[PDB]
Write a structure and sequence with these properties.
part of a larger assembly; 3 chains; A: mainly beta; four-stranded antiparallel beta sheet; binds magnesium ion; binds zinc ion; RNA-binding; Large ribosomal subunit protein uL2 (chain C); Ribosomal_zn-bd (chain A); Ribosomal_LSU_eL42 (chain A); cytoplasm (chain A)
RNA sequence: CAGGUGGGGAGUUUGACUGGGGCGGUACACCUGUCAAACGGUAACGCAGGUGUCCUAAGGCGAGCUCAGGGAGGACAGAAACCUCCCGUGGAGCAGAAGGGCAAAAGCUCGCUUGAUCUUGAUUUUCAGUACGAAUACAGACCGUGAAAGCGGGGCCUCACGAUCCUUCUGACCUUUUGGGUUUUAAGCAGGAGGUGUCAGAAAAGUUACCACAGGGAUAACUGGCUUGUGGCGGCCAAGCGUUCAUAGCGACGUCGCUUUUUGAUCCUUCGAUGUCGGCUCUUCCUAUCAUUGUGAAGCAGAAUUCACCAAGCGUUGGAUUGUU
RNA sequence: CGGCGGGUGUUGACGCGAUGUGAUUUCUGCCCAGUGCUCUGAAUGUCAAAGUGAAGAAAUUCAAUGAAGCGCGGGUAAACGGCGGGAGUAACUAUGACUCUCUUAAGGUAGCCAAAUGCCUCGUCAUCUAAUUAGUGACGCGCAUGAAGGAUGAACGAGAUU
RNA sequence: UCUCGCCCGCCGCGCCGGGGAGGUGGAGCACGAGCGCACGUGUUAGGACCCGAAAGAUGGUGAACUAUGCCUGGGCAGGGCG
RNA sequence: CCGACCCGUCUUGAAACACGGACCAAGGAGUCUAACACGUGCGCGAGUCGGGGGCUCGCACGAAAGCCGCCGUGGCGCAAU
RNA sequence: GCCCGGAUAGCUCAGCUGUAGAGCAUCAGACUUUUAAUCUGAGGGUCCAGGGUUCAAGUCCCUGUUCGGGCGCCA
RNA sequence: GUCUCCGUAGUGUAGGGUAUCACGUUCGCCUAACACGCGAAAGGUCCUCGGUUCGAAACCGGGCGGAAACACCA
């Protein structure tokens, strides 16, 4: 799918519709000091082998794309996450389609 | 799941050497002053089958 | 070893007397496994030297 | 202490449905038409199909047009290039399967846009009236569009999807961080995402004829039982064969049966066991009669043979090969 | 389990240890692509802990460096193993010496065969019998023969067969 | 917990404290009904109504049979080939 | 004379050619603890409960019963979110 | 997910923050009885894309897409 | 029977935007002639039907064949 790099949508901090820069959200790096990670490391230390399940039965081929919106107001740089439906090909601000044109021969 | 032959050989029990009728360890004489500085004479008293 | 059962030899077993795995075995194989040609640099017929 | 190697050894697992299991398939989560017996619901490894997507427009609004096809015309131009008129209830299109729906539409083309946004509840669908998903009607903001009424919180409707734990990101000049204070850090509260397709969501390869246990006739292999597709044996019609002549003897196209000496189908009995092929031996029974007794018919001169009737009294053999039937 | 513990070893390559094949005779063909094994580290890529440097107030974060192994490069099949198709073609027909291509890491060589290995199959021909799904001899596009095992060959066998 | 909005308090005038209206979440209030003891029924953990595996683990006993190595003993007519 | 298949059990279906049962005697299988829930009975009742401790000729019964009250600490209830 | 290495005349390799070179492809000449073999030349650029750092870029940084290894694996 | 694959000049094969390679065939050279060699040319509903698409040999279904692999325990 194609979505523009900017959109005018509601900003919760401003409380009104504002322009928003749109990027794609990527999962951040694991903290290694998150409580579950600490519990997992303590559990894994020692003998006993693997103590938690490892999924290894992948079935989905796509992910739900998450749009990171950022209000363009200089005093309001508030961010929001919008998820759109599952898609295989996603692009930001691609070439917009035309109607009455010739297809490449 | 069973200890193999060749593994069982190191335990020794049945795979020890048959040394009952052997005539002794075949060795040169221990080095000493005569070996180190001159020569010592011996006589071949016997030749035997080990 | 091919004439043995799988329980007492790595080469044992099978409906035909075949080794079924490469007879050349690495040097650091555990005891009970390093049977056959141990850490062989070559196999065959020695044609040349 | 750290990394590598490590079936030498250890522990464990090796889905389910299933006209037995395995192989095959997915009838395992969904959607359309039918089944389905005119409310709704309704099954089979029932039938015909589809789905794990796609779309900054194919979303939203407004405006203006009319589509498929056909007829008649126009230089090159022809069956199809473009232009014009006429007919055109949709016979087109609306992303896809199918069904429904739709014409100054919901289709096509333009213009402006982001209601595909921020929120709380209620409700419908499956339903236990639990969840998810999807959907409907509102209400409160902030907007878009249009002159306006209005319409819009995704796609005309019916499908297009995912818990706990954990992780990640976003938001509150928010709460906690353990005797007090400051600051990092961590924890929390609310909302998205990373997925469990066995789709209410374990983390999972084989082999055993060396095998074991608890059971199962809920379930196969052998008999028996229902059935008779297939096998076998008959009948009806008579186009034809029979040098002529349908029917002496046969019988195409059709069609009606019988039998359980074939092989299937099923799984009712038997899994705290009904000894599983063939041969040998021995007895009895059936007739759909090979021979023999008594007959009828012939394309019956005699001889031989063929068809049919009463008929199972009596007989139906010796061997080579093959475990064989 | 452990000790510089113990067996081979009262031993030393004509020795110990580990494999395969299985007397003699005659041979033992091609393939190092795959999986193993092994040799070399050559600039070398990756690569843990520790160590080094930097930022920070510290926890911490980052960077530099870079052991084996793995990659990269050779060898090895008496290591495990493997060893092809489709068309046309000779003055009767029939075969195909021969010729085209596609492809492999190499395309099964010498031999041997309906063999204890061949489905079709009770193969085909000959012999053995009156009659043989049996036996033997021969043939070979051989479902699916084949070389550390192939093919033979006396003597022997409470082995299978005519 | 959201949305809207205006006031009030002071030994600390504050990034202070309190109050309102309208929705919504709660296993609440709205002049108590519990506590103790006994009995019955149901569910559960325990041997768990009774009997029943194939297994798994810990620690011991066996080479008087057999398998193999070592030590020390004993034994094996009569003929053939040559 | 009429009626009458052998019981138990699993089962859609047993008299079954389904299993157990030759006969007799004795033994033989929903128990106790803990925790809940609800119902019922009793006492007191915004309270209730001494169960742990202590005091009482230390003891046939009595290892019982009686009492504590500035022993009500505490539990549950009386307030939720 | 991490460490990287790679994308460039039609094709590949090489390359300087201040004019993208070479080879393999195409074309014109010789060339050889002749084919091969060989130069003479000529034409030919994805400098893998987008944005920024840049006066100025493949060459500096992010957004990316493929390819190859070595790693890493709690919804 | 189930599952999978294939169908393109005469032959053996490559390969969503006017179908490649080699052999073969035709023509002209060279040779006394043939072959080799040299220079040119021709030759294929991409098996059949339907559909998506502006456009199908390719993508998706049906059918004609052909080719493999399974076809076990009693
Ligand atoms: Mg054996
Ligand atoms: Mg083993
Ligand atoms: Mg073996
Ligand atoms: Mg093999
Ligand atoms: Mg194991
Ligand atoms: Mg009805
Ligand atoms: Mg109905
Ligand atoms: Mg309109
Ligand atoms: Mg509204
Ligand atoms: Mg709608
Ligand atoms: Mg489920
Ligand atoms: Mg049954
Ligand atoms: Mg006639
Ligand atoms: Mg019996
Ligand atoms: Mg019997
Ligand atoms: Mg009769
Ligand atoms: Mg030997
Ligand atoms: Mg060889
Ligand atoms: Mg290294
Ligand atoms: Mg070699
Ligand atoms: Mg051969
Ligand atoms: Mg043969
Ligand atoms: Mg045979
Ligand atoms: Mg015979
Ligand atoms: Mg023969
Ligand atoms: Mg021959
Ligand atoms: Mg209850
Ligand atoms: Mg018990
Ligand atoms: Mg166990
Ligand atoms: Mg003894
Ligand atoms: Mg029973
Ligand atoms: Mg039954
Ligand atoms: Mg009964
Ligand atoms: Mg019965
Ligand atoms: Mg019985
Ligand atoms: Mg029973
Ligand atoms: Mg009995
Ligand atoms: Mg009894
Ligand atoms: Mg009694
Ligand atoms: Mg008392
Ligand atoms: Mg108190
Ligand atoms: Zn804002």
């Amino acid at each position: 799918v194609n979505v523009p790099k900017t959109r005018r949508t509601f900003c919760k901090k401003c409380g009104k519709h504002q322009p928003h820069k749109v990027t794609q959200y990527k999962k951040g790096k694991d903290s290694l000091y998150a409580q579950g990670k600490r519990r997992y490391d303590r559990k894994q230390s020692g003998y006993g082998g693997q103590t938690k399940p490892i999924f290894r039965k992948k079935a989905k081929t796509t992910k739900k794309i998450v749009l990171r919106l950022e209000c363009v107001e200089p005093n309001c740089r508030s961010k929001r996450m919008l998820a759109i439906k599952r898609c295989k090909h996603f692009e930001l601000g691609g070439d917009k389609k035309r109607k009455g044109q010739v297809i490449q021969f | 799941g069973r200890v193999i032959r060749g593994q069982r050989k190191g335990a020794g029990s049945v795979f020890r050497a048959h040394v009952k009728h052997r005539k002794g360890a075949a060795r040169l004489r221990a080095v000493d002053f005569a070996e180190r500085h001159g020569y010592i004479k011996g006589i071949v008293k016997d030749i035997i089958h080990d | 070893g091919v004439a043995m059962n799988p329980v007492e030899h790595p080469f044992g077993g099978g409906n035909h007397q075949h080794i079924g795995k490469p007879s050349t075995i690495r040097r650091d194989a555990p005891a009970g496994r390093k049977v056959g040609l141990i850490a062989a640099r070559r196999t065959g017929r020695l044609r040349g030297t």
